[PDB]
């Protein structure tokens, strides 16, 4: 219970903070062809398109 409230308060703190967003939006695209060739795993596969959970 307490950690559900604290993670909601972290999302309050950061996450729609304007300048952290403007720090990291523009950078680091991952092509899905490169996401499968270069052997990415986990959160890279969850973020870069294709649906994949072990």
């Amino acid at each position: 219970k307490n950690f559900s409230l604290r993670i909601d308060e972290l999302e309050e703190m950061l996450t729609n903070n304007r300048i952290w967003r403007n720090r990291t939006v523009d950078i680091g695209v991952v092509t899905a062809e490169d996401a499968l060739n270069y052997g990415f795993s986990g959160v890279m596969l969850r973020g870069s398109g294709i649906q994949w959970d072990l």
Partner: protein, 68 residues
């Protein structure tokens, strides 16, 4: 008898909602408040400026009549 640790009688719900209350009001109200307080300050500043203009003219009268 057995003395493991099961959940005794079941545990209640645990929230996981993104609960953001969105404190504040609309932006048009924010512009209205900002322009209103700004114009209030402008009127008060105008009045104090012209009062000190009156007193500055009186100090000019002092330096004129004091000179010969």
């Amino acid at each position: 008898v057995k003395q493991d640790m099961p959940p005794v009688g079941g545990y209640g719900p645990i929230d996981y909602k993104r609960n953001l209350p969105r404190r504040g009001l609309s932006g048009y109200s924010m512009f209205a408040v900002g322009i209103g307080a700004l114009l209030f300050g402008y009127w008060s500043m105008m009045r104090w400026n012209r009062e000190r203009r009156r007193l500055q003219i009186e100090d000019f009268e002092a330096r004129i009549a004091l000179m010969p």
